[model samples]
Target: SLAPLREFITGLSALLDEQPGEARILREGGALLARLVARDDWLPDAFAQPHPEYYQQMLLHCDSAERFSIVSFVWGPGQRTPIHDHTVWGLIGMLRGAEYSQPFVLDGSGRPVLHGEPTRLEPGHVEAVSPTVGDIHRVHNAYDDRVSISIHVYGANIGGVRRSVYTEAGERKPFISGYSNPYLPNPWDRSK
Candidate 1:
C-alpha cells in the first residue's frame, strides 16, 4: 500500500494551498519527505528497480496542476549522476542505503567546479535545493555493492522541466529527464 505517499501528497497539497513562501515550503516539505522515507514500506517493487547503466528516476506522482511532483530515484551499485541543476525548488529524502552530493558552481565558461563540501544522506534524512540556494550538484550511490534509493519532490513537473547536465569539463548540456518507468504506482485505491 502507498499509504505514506498518499499522506505526503495530502499534507503537501494542503500546505501549498496556503500559498506559503518557497522557503517555508521547503522547510515544511522536507518534513513530509522525511516522514515518508522513514518507514520505507510504501514504495512498490516495480518503482524500485535500478538500471545498470544509470540511476532511475521513477515518477510516482504529479499533481494535476503540476504544482509539484514526486519521484523515486533508484541508484545502481556504483552509479552516479553528472553535475546537474533542477531549476526549481526541490527536496530529497533518502529511503534506502545512502548517497553523497557534491555541490558545484559554474565558471565563466559555464564549467561546473566544486563549490562546497559534499553532503552524505543516510536513510530517512532530508535535504533541499533550489536556484536561490544550492542548485547544482553531482550525486552517487554510497555503496559499491548494493542499491540505494531516494525520494525527490520538485516544485514543478520535473519530468517535463528543461534542465542542464555537465560533462567532466563542465560543459552545459540541456536535457529533459523524462520518467524512467512507463507506469506510476497507484496511490488512490483505498481497497489496496
Candidate 2:
C-alpha cells in the first residue's frame, strides 16, 4: 500500500536536486506533493470529522533538519490559519474533508494580491509551496463548515527555535518553540 507514495517521494527527492530556484522548485514540488496527498488509502480516518482548530503530532516517515517537524493538522468549520509562511519549504496533503488555500502574489511594493481565494483541498490532495510561492497566504476548512485534516512536511525545524508568521500587509513575525510530534498509527507507536 505504501509503494506508490514511496516511489513518488523517492523521485521527488531526486527532482529537488534538479530544481533549485524557489519558483521552479515550488512549481515542480507542487506536482509531487499533490501526488502523495491524492492517495487516499493510507491517510487517517480521523481526518474525516467536522471542522475546528486542532492538531496531532507524528514522527515524519523521512526526517531532516529543514523539516517543519509536522504534527497532524485538524481543522473545524470556519477555522483558518493566520496568513503566514513556513520560512522554508512546506508540503501539505489533505487527509479528509476539504481545505481551502488561497495563493497570493507579492507585488513589487510588497503588498499582496488581496483577492486571493481559497483553493479547495479535497481528501488525497497534496501541495507544496516554497517560501517563494506567493509565500504569504491563509488557509481554512471551507469557511469552517466541515472538518479537514492534513499532514505537513516542513523543511524547517518547528521546535528548538522560532517559526515565521506574516500579517496581510506582508509584515513578518518570528515564532519560536512551538509545535511537536503527533500520534502515529498502532504498531508504529514505539513510545508505548
Candidate 3:
C-alpha cells in the first residue's frame, strides 16, 4: 500500500537527482509506474470513485517547489477529455478499469489530425508522452458502464501549467487546470 508509493517517491527523487531532462523523466517514470501498478495494493479504495457531474482529477502529491506532481484521474462511464497537450512530459498508469487514448498532431493548417491508432490500456498498463515525442492526446473510460482510474505523474504541477486544448479542426485555446483538492487527502482519514 503506502510502502510502494513511498518507494516510488524515493526512486523518483533519486532519478531527479541525476537532473535528467523531461523526456528522460517521462520514460523512466513511466517504467516505474508500470512496476508499481503490478502490485495489488498500490492504490487504495479511496482513489477509485468517479464524480457524477464530470471526471475527477485528484491531487495525490506535488513537490514543494512544484517541480513535479502526482495525480489521479477518476473517469465516470463514457467521460472523456478534450484533445489536449501537456506542456511538459507526463506518464500515466491505468490502475483500475480501462482507458482509450487517441494520439493527435497538428496538420499543415494547424488542425489536429489523427496521427496514430487509438491506444487501449488495461489495468496495470502504463504509457508516457513528452514534447519531444507523442504529447497530444485525448483519453476516456473504455467501459461506458464502469469507472476508470489512472495515476499520472508529470514534470510540473500540471494542474497549474498554462496549456492548450485543441479542437478537431486544429483550433487551440489556452487554459490552466488547477487541482481539485488543495492538498492530498489522507487515505485513512476521509475527513482530512
Candidate 4:
C-alpha cells in the first residue's frame, strides 16, 4: 500500500536532490503531488469542520518527507485561512467537500491591493502552488453546510519550519509552527 507513494515522493525528492539549486524540482514535484492527492474517497468525515477536533485527525495521517503526508483538513462554513503565504512551496489537492480560495495581487507595500473573487474549488481540484498563483488570499468553506479537506506535499518538512501567518491587510503576525496529531486506528490486542 505504501509502495507507490513511497516510490513517488522518494523518486521525486531524489531528482530534486540531484539539482539542489534548480527551481524546476519544486515545480515538477508540485505537479506530481497534485495529481496523487486528487482522489475521491480520500475525504474523511472531519473535512466538514475545521475545528480543533478535526485538526487532530489531519495530524495523525500526515507524515514527514521520509514519506508523503495525507492531511485531512476540515473548515466549517465560515472558517478559512488568513491572507498568508507558505514559507515554502506546496502542492494542495482537495479530497472532500470544497474550498474557495481568493487569489491576490500584492502591491509594492507588500500588501494585496487587488484580489480576485473567491474561487470555489470542489473535491479533486488541485492547486499546484500558493506562491506563484495566489500570493496572498484566504480559503473559506463558502457555504454553510460544507467543509473541505485537502492534502499538501512540501519539498521540506512543513511542520518543522516557522510558518508566516499574515493578516488580511498583510500585517505579519507571529510565527507558529508545530506538528499535527490526528486520530489513529487501534490495533488488535490480546488483553481483551
lDDT per residue as tens, model 4, 40-143: 54333433346643232244233433333434455655566666666555556666667778776667876665475667766656664445544456666666
lDDT to native, each model: 0.92, 0.59, 0.81, 0.55
**Whole-structure CA lDDT of model 4:** 0.55
What value does the lDDT take at residue 108 in candidate 4?
A: 82
Clashes of 1: 0
For model 3, the stretches where C-alpha displacement exceeds 4 angstroms are 168-170, 186-192
The global Cα lDDT (0 to 1) of model 3 is 0.81
Pairs that collide, model 1: none
Tens-place lDDT per residue, model 2, 1-192, is 545445554666677656466665556656766676676665555433433235334444543434234435767666777666556777777776777887766567655565555678777667766666545567876644555677676655545445566665676577653543354343232353
- The best-first sequence of candidates by lDDT reads 1, 3, 2, 4
Instruction: Give me the candidate number with maximum TM-score.
Output: 1
lDDT by residue for model 1 over 83-190, one digit each (tens)? 899999999999999999999998887788899799999999999999998999989999999999999999999999999998776678998999888899878888
Q: What's model 2's lDDT at 124?
A: 67
lDDT of 2 at 173: 73
Poorest lDDT segment (10 consecutive residues) of candidate 3: 183-192
Least accurate 10 contiguous residues by lDDT in model 4:
53-62
Better of 1 and 2 by lDDT: 1
